[PDB]
Structure formats: structure tokens, C-alpha cells
Amino acid sequence: GAVAHANSIVQQLVSEGADISHTRNMLRNAMNGDAVAFSRVEQNIFRQHFPNMPMHGISRDSELAIELRGALRRAVHQ
């Protein structure tokens, strides 16, 4: 479920021309509760998948975020 969802987000990021190495850094910051600055493309995309993100950000315990973190890491390396 969340795994398939995460893989699709990676596809969306790549398709929209996002620099996923940069996305990995921002996602890491978000999950640590650090201030973040997603690009316009990333922000637009993440808002579609993390509907409560504007106010709450992205939880390090979020099942989707965790899977996304793994999917992004493998994508950059693959």
C-alpha cells in the first residue's frame, strides 16, 4: 500500500524534473523536524501526498514518509 504509493511519488518527482538528490535532503530535514525549503515543484507534489503538511510538516513516524525515504535512496543509487 504505502510502498506502491511511495514508488509512485518517486516517479512523479522524476517526471516533473525534480532533483531527487535534493528531495532526499529536504525529506531528511522534514523528518527531523528541521526547517525546510522544498522547491516549488517538490512542494506542489508533496502537498498532494501529505495533505496536512502545510501546518504539520512530515512525520518521521509516517509510514508513507518512511517508504518514500527508502524509495528515494534506492532511486538515486539505482
PDB file of C-alpha atoms in Angstrom:
ATOM      1  CA  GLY A   1       0.000   0.000   0.000  1.00  0.00           C
ATOM      2  CA  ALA A   2       2.317   2.722   1.269  1.00  0.00           C
ATOM      3  CA  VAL A   3       5.150   1.061  -0.662  1.00  0.00           C
ATOM      4  CA  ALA A   4       3.359   1.363  -4.004  1.00  0.00           C
ATOM      5  CA  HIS A   5       2.332   4.912  -3.059  1.00  0.00           C
ATOM      6  CA  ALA A   6       5.948   5.881  -2.271  1.00  0.00           C
ATOM      7  CA  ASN A   7       7.235   4.406  -5.540  1.00  0.00           C
ATOM      8  CA  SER A   8       4.658   6.465  -7.458  1.00  0.00           C
ATOM      9  CA  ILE A   9       5.798   9.654  -5.734  1.00  0.00           C
ATOM     10  CA  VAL A  10       9.364   8.995  -6.894  1.00  0.00           C
ATOM     11  CA  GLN A  11       8.035   8.526 -10.439  1.00  0.00           C
ATOM     12  CA  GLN A  12       6.111  11.792 -10.168  1.00  0.00           C
ATOM     13  CA  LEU A  13       9.164  13.697  -8.904  1.00  0.00           C
ATOM     14  CA  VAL A  14      11.391  12.389 -11.694  1.00  0.00           C
ATOM     15  CA  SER A  15       8.721  13.002 -14.331  1.00  0.00           C
ATOM     16  CA  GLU A  16       8.289  16.601 -13.199  1.00  0.00           C
ATOM     17  CA  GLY A  17      12.019  17.300 -13.395  1.00  0.00           C
ATOM     18  CA  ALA A  18      12.751  17.410  -9.668  1.00  0.00           C
ATOM     19  CA  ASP A  19      16.310  16.810  -8.454  1.00  0.00           C
ATOM     20  CA  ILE A  20      15.670  13.803  -6.217  1.00  0.00           C
ATOM     21  CA  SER A  21      19.092  14.074  -4.569  1.00  0.00           C
ATOM     22  CA  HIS A  22      17.837  17.444  -3.311  1.00  0.00           C
ATOM     23  CA  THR A  23      14.459  15.937  -2.430  1.00  0.00           C
ATOM     24  CA  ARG A  24      16.222  13.343  -0.264  1.00  0.00           C
ATOM     25  CA  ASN A  25      17.948  16.134   1.685  1.00  0.00           C
ATOM     26  CA  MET A  26      14.734  18.051   2.237  1.00  0.00           C
ATOM     27  CA  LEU A  27      12.766  14.958   3.233  1.00  0.00           C
ATOM     28  CA  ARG A  28      15.515  14.131   5.734  1.00  0.00           C
ATOM     29  CA  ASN A  29      15.237  17.665   7.177  1.00  0.00           C
ATOM     30  CA  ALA A  30      11.444  17.449   7.344  1.00  0.00           C
ATOM     31  CA  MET A  31      11.501  14.091   9.105  1.00  0.00           C
ATOM     32  CA  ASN A  32      13.946  15.500  11.666  1.00  0.00           C
ATOM     33  CA  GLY A  33      11.694  18.478  12.264  1.00  0.00           C
ATOM     34  CA  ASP A  34      14.297  20.841  10.814  1.00  0.00           C
ATOM     35  CA  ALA A  35      13.188  23.942   8.927  1.00  0.00           C
ATOM     36  CA  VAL A  36      12.723  23.050   5.253  1.00  0.00           C
ATOM     37  CA  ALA A  37      12.615  24.765   1.870  1.00  0.00           C
ATOM     38  CA  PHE A  38      11.176  22.425  -0.758  1.00  0.00           C
ATOM     39  CA  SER A  39      11.401  23.747  -4.305  1.00  0.00           C
ATOM     40  CA  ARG A  40       8.182  24.902  -5.961  1.00  0.00           C
ATOM     41  CA  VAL A  41       7.941  21.596  -7.834  1.00  0.00           C
ATOM     42  CA  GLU A  42       8.625  19.489  -4.722  1.00  0.00           C
ATOM     43  CA  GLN A  43       6.235  21.481  -2.558  1.00  0.00           C
ATOM     44  CA  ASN A  44       3.438  21.186  -5.122  1.00  0.00           C
ATOM     45  CA  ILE A  45       3.998  17.427  -5.319  1.00  0.00           C
ATOM     46  CA  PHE A  46       4.337  16.770  -1.581  1.00  0.00           C
ATOM     47  CA  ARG A  47       1.137  18.690  -0.822  1.00  0.00           C
ATOM     48  CA  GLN A  48      -0.747  16.129  -2.939  1.00  0.00           C
ATOM     49  CA  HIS A  49       0.631  13.246  -0.846  1.00  0.00           C
ATOM     50  CA  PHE A  50       0.939  14.830   2.611  1.00  0.00           C
ATOM     51  CA  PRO A  51      -2.362  16.824   2.872  1.00  0.00           C
ATOM     52  CA  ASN A  52      -1.641  18.028   6.421  1.00  0.00           C
ATOM     53  CA  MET A  53       1.946  19.031   5.616  1.00  0.00           C
ATOM     54  CA  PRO A  54       1.385  22.808   5.345  1.00  0.00           C
ATOM     55  CA  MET A  55       0.699  23.003   9.073  1.00  0.00           C
ATOM     56  CA  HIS A  56       2.355  19.860  10.440  1.00  0.00           C
ATOM     57  CA  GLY A  57       5.210  19.064   8.071  1.00  0.00           C
ATOM     58  CA  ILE A  58       6.182  15.410   7.573  1.00  0.00           C
ATOM     59  CA  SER A  59       6.412  12.944  10.482  1.00  0.00           C
ATOM     60  CA  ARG A  60       9.466  10.743  10.947  1.00  0.00           C
ATOM     61  CA  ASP A  61       6.958   8.075  12.004  1.00  0.00           C
ATOM     62  CA  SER A  62       4.791   8.444   8.886  1.00  0.00           C
ATOM     63  CA  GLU A  63       4.547   5.083   7.124  1.00  0.00           C
ATOM     64  CA  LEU A  64       4.438   6.832   3.748  1.00  0.00           C
ATOM     65  CA  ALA A  65       7.403   9.096   4.567  1.00  0.00           C
ATOM     66  CA  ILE A  66       9.450   6.100   5.723  1.00  0.00           C
ATOM     67  CA  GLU A  67       8.735   4.209   2.490  1.00  0.00           C
ATOM     68  CA  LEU A  68       9.374   7.361   0.461  1.00  0.00           C
ATOM     69  CA  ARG A  69      12.747   7.792   2.170  1.00  0.00           C
ATOM     70  CA  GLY A  70      13.710   4.270   1.131  1.00  0.00           C
ATOM     71  CA  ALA A  71      12.341   4.596  -2.402  1.00  0.00           C
ATOM     72  CA  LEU A  72      14.253   7.849  -2.941  1.00  0.00           C
ATOM     73  CA  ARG A  73      17.507   6.376  -1.644  1.00  0.00           C
ATOM     74  CA  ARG A  74      17.263   3.387  -3.974  1.00  0.00           C
ATOM     75  CA  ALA A  75      16.226   5.616  -6.891  1.00  0.00           C
ATOM     76  CA  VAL A  76      19.281   7.864  -6.539  1.00  0.00           C
ATOM     77  CA  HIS A  77      21.556   4.832  -6.309  1.00  0.00           C
ATOM     78  CA  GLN A  78      19.798   2.552  -8.821  1.00  0.00           C
TER      79      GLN A  78
END
